[PDB]
């Protein structure tokens, strides 16, 4: 198969700690504001060994395409220039992002019918829960 338990269109159901997460990420007040207006739909899709996550909103349409284990450059939603590496372990996708000597983790896994994304920075954890569209 491949990475097939993540594939689909996902819609945000509940967010918690995300603004505080971005405070720890070092994101400025104005950007934190815009970032918390948007409640994007996450759209996942896999071709061969390349996975794609498309956060698609009115304000911003981002899209990362990654080979898995291979380092790629990313511009994050909040306007960071990052180097990311994505790993699959224990049924979970672990994305690490590094920039200006800093590192954060975005772990995406299934619970049951839902997909949970946790972002972690210096012991602030954000938790967003998506369900299927």
């Amino acid at each position, epitope marked *: 198969s491949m990475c097939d338990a993540f594939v689909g269109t996902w819609k945000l159901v509940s967010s918690e700690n995300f603004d505080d997460y971005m405070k720890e990420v070092g994101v400025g007040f104005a950007t934190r504001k*815009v970032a918390g207006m948007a409640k994007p739909n996450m759209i996942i899709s896999v071709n061969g060994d390349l996975v794609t996550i498309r956060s698609e909103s009115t304000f*911003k349409n981002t899209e990362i395409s990654f080979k898995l284990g291979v380092e790629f450059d990313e511009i994050t939603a909040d306007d960071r220039k990052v180097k990311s590496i994505i790993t699959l372990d224990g049924g979970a996708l672990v994305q690490v992002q590094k920039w200006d000597g800093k590192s954060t983790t975005i772990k995406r896994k299934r619970d049951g019918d839902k997909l949970v994304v946790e972002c972690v920075m210096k012991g602030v954890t954000s938790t967003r829960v998506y369900e299927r569209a």
Partner: antibody, heavy 119, light 109 residues
Framework: QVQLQQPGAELVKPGASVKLSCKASGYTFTSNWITWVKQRPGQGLEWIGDIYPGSGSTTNNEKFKSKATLTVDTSSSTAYMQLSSLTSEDSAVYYC????????????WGQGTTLTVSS | EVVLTQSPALMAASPGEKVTITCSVSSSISSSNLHWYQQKSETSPKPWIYGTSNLASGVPVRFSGSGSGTSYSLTISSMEAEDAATYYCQQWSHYPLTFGAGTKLELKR
């Protein structure tokens, strides 16, 4: 290139109102916050507000609540700040600037518009 | 409100000389949201250093920026005549957005 255009100078009588412009170009307009800064002669820099073109949502200084009101027209690619109930205290240079996301610093600035309120 | 206090309000330096301004904060900010601008002759101020230490496009290499918790600073390694100007730090980690009052840098003679 990235550029915000403001008229050079404006003359308005006391008690009247005035609406100032910041015309943008060289980048996608709705992707960046636009801020307004007031500077009087001799004195330093004063922040009025931010507006997000594309949403029109604002962040504002509590010191300028009555005075200033921020809006945009995306069709024109313009930002506007309206001042009202004008006094001599409003004679200053007004800078609009494009804000740069994460970090949130002002990378591009319009020349000021020198507002003069006088009889 | 995060109050930014900038030390020497007024400063004179002769070409060649090392120069340090401080921007000192009343409470904690994220180093990524502390910025310096340089203004000449009250025309449009210019971005100089962003995120404490980054340094804007076309800003010379003699300039650098530093920071830590209580204080941030701007340093010129060697003064040039064109560096005489008024330099404001500014903060956007927390509402409201604040400025410091500036330090004017004049040429010493």
């Amino acid at each position: 290139q990235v550029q915000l255009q403001q008229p050079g100078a404006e003359l308005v009588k006391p008690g009247a109102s005035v609406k100032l412009s910041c015309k943008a170009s060289g980048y996608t307009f709705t992707s960046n916050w636009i801020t307004w800064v007031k500077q009087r002669p001799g004195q330093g820099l004063e922040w009025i507000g931010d507006i997000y073109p594309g949403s029109g949502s604002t962040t504002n200084n509590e010191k300028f609540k009555s005075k200033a009101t921020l809006t945009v027209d995306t069709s024109s690619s313009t930002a506007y700040m309206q001042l009202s109930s004008l006094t001599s205290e409003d004679s200053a240079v007004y800078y609009c600037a494009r804000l740069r996301g994460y970090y949130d610093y002002f990378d591009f600035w319009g020349q000021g518009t020198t507002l003069t309120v006088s009889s | 409100e995060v109050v930014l206090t900038q030390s020497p309000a007024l400063m004179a330096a002769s070409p060649g000389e090392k120069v340090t301004i401080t921007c000192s904060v009343s409470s904690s900010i994220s180093s990524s949201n502390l910025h310096w601008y340089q203004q000449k002759s009250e025309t449009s101020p210019k971005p100089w250093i962003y995120g404490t230490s980054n340094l804007a496009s076309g800003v010379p290499v003699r300039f650098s920026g530093s920071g830590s918790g209580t204080s941030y600073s701007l340093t010129i390694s060697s003064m040039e005549a064109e560096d005489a100007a008024t330099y404001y730090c500014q903060q956007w980690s927390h509402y409201p957005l604040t400025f410091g009052a500036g330090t004017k840098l004049e040429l010493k003679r």
